[PDB]
Each structure stands twice: as C-alpha cells, then as structure tokens.
C-alpha cells in the first residue's frame, strides 16, 4: 500500500506533486484487475494542472510513501519488482503507447527484491531521461507486490498480483531527439493471466527463478537505479 509524493530532478526536490504533477488516486489501495481502465494510471486518471520541467539526461527520482512522506514506504511483506514506463501525454495512456525504461526484480548478490531496496532508499528510485522529442510525457511507475500472487485475481478476487501504479506529468524541454520514442504496449492489455511474472509463488519458488513481466526495456533507455538521492526531512 503505497503512493508517490513527488519527484526530484538531479537531486533537487520539486515539492509536493499530489494532484499537481502526479495523477494521484484517492488512496493507496492496490490495483488487481488486469483488464480494468485503472491499470493505465490508477483509479483517478486525469490531466492535472502542472508538469515537471526536465531535459534529456536529467535524473528523475520518484518518491513513494505509505501514510506520510518519508515514513516506512511500503509494507515489508510486499516483495516484488519495480518498473517505469513512458508514454506521450498525447495518448493519455490509451492505445499501444507505453515504453519501458527500467525494470528491476531480484538482485542475487544482496539477495533483495527491488521493493526491499526501495524501503532502504526511503522510497526513492530514479531513471535517466531519454533523448526523445521535446514535449509532454507521462512517466508511469509500477510496483508489483507478489505476496498473494500465487493465485490469479480473475479466479480468486481476494488474492492476485497487486499493482501500485502512479503517473507523473513531465515536460521534456531540451533534447537532441536522437532516440525517438517507439510505439509500446497498452495498459490495460500487456498483462494477462498467462503473462510471466504475474502468477508466482514467492513462498515455494526461489527468487532467482523469477522472470519479470514483458515487454523488455527499450534500447533507447539510459538506465536508472534504486537509491536515495536527497533527504525529505530537510523540509
């Protein structure tokens, strides 16, 4: 159970973005229905007044929270992967538009799921802004908690993979446009009950056998990472 407070740009806090540059839902309840319009940008998808200015090669850091900013972030039972997608604000989420810029599941060395590391990072994970056409974009961050993903929602409505999904409005000002944005996948639509990574037993199966949902990460991505970049408590 978790939501996004706002973003930092190159380590600089852009202030509370809720309902201002983030399309925030009314609360932190998960999304579970794979076919629902809520898979796009959660239950409350609508243009909000503002958009964060960035340039290609900026580091955009999303800050998640549970109840208050910089609290325990997400419950420690909610093991799973984290992903970030981009689409043009043009689409409004609809059609085959979403492109993956980041995926992180289980790191075998430290033996931590991406969600564990996000808790350590005080709710902060980042992506480098790719060299797409200047303009207005939605960045959709998704945490998949798998603590009940042994069943499917469509067969057992009280269980299933849980998606904590949030969309940020971002304006990309300076960019050479060396990597124009391709078409990508629809949400709802890219995740179905058959798709790998959706049904999985984190209690019986080992985390190394986990295989995150498709699609794979666009080659035009410049990466990202899970790690604190600023301190919220100095504010």
Ligand X SMILES: OC[C@H]1O[C@@H](O[C@H]2[C@H](O)[C@@H](O)[C@H](O[C@H]3[C@H](O)[C@@H](O)[C@H](O[C@H]4[C@H](O)[C@@H](O)[C@H](O)O[C@@H]4CO)O[C@@H]3CO)O[C@@H]2CO)[C@H](O)[C@@H](O)[C@@H]1O
Ligand Y SMILES: *[C@@H]1O[C@H](CO)[C@@H](O)[C@H](O)[C@H]1NC(C)=O
Residues that bind Cu ion (CB under 5 A): 1
Query: In the complex with ligand Y, which residue's Cβ is closer, 38 or 58?
Result: 38
* CA separation for the pair 188, 95 (Å, rounded): 9
Going residue by residue from 147 to 176, which x/- string records binding to ligand Y, judged by CB under 6 A?
Answer: ----------x-------------------
Kindly report whether the peptide bond that precedes residue 106 is cis, defined as omega within 30 degrees of 0: no
Per CB under 6 A, the segment of 33-41, 48-56, 84-92, 141-149 that binds ligand Y is: 33-41
* CA separation for the pair 182, 175 (Å, rounded): 16
Residue 67 partner contact from ligand X, Cu ion, ligand Y, none using kind-dependent CB cut-offs of 5 to 8 Å: ligand X
Residue 128 annotated as binding? no
Task: Give the dihedral sign, CA 17/198/98/173.
Answer: positive
Both ends of the chain: CA-CA distance in Å?
A: 24
Residue 140 annotated as binding? yes
Going residue by residue from 94 to 133, which x/- string records binding to ligand X, judged by CB under 6 A?
Answer: ----------------------------------------
Quote the least distance from Cβ 36 to ligand Y, whole Å. 4
In the window 180-199, what residues touch ligand X (CB under 6 A)?
Answer: none
- Kindly report each contact of residues 213-217 with a partner whose C-beta sits within 8 Å and lies 24 or more positions away, as own/partner: 213/83, 213/144, 214/190, 215/100, 215/184, 215/185, 215/190, 216/100, 216/103, 217/100, 217/101, 217/102, 217/103
Residue 155 partner contact from ligand Y, Cu ion, ligand X, none using kind-dependent CB cut-offs of 5 to 8 Å: none
Query: In the complex with Cu ion, which residue's Cβ is closer, 1 or 117?
Result: 1
Token pair 């057992």: residue:
156
Kindly report whether the peptide bond that precedes residue 215 is cis, defined as omega within 30 degrees of 0: yes
Q: Considering the rule CB under 6 A, would residue 36 count as an interface residue with ligand Y?
A: yes
Binding residues for O2: 147, 162
Q: Footprint of ligand Y on this chain (CB under 6 A)?
A: 33, 35-37, 157
Q: Footprint of ligand X on this chain (CB under 6 A)?
A: 1, 28, 66-67, 75, 77, 147-148
């Amino acid at each position: 159970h978790t939501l996004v407070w706002g973003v930092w740009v190159n380590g600089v806090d852009q202030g509370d973005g809720r309902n201002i540059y983030i399309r925030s839902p009314p609360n932190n309840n998960p999304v579970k229905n794979l076919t629902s319009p809520d898979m796009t940008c959660n239950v409350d998808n609508r243009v909000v007044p503002k958009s964060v200015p960035v340039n290609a090669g900026d580091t955009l850091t999303f800050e998640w929270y549970h109840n208050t900013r910089d609290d325990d972030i997400i419950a420690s039972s909610h093991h799973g992967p984290i992903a970030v997608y981009i689409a043009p604000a043009a689409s409004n989420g609809q059609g085959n538009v979403w492109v993956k810029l980041f995926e992180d599941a289980y790191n075998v060395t430290n033996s931590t799921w991406a969600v564990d590391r996000l808790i350590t990072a005080h709710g902060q994970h980042s992506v480098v802004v790719p060299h797409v056409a200047p303009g207005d974009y939605l960045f959709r961050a998704e945490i998949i908690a798998l603590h009940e993903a042994d069943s499917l929602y469509s067969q057992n409505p009280i269980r299933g993979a849980q998606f904590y999904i949030s969309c940020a409005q971002i304006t990309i000002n300076s960019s050479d446009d060396s990597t124009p944005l391709p078409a990508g996948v629809p949400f709802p639509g890219a995740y179905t009950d058959s798709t790998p990574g959706i049904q999985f037993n984190i209690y019986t199966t080992p985390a190394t056998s986990y295989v995150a949902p498709p699609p794979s990460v666009w080659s035009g991505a410049l990466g990202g990472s899970i790690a604190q970049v600023g301190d919220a408590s100095l504010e």
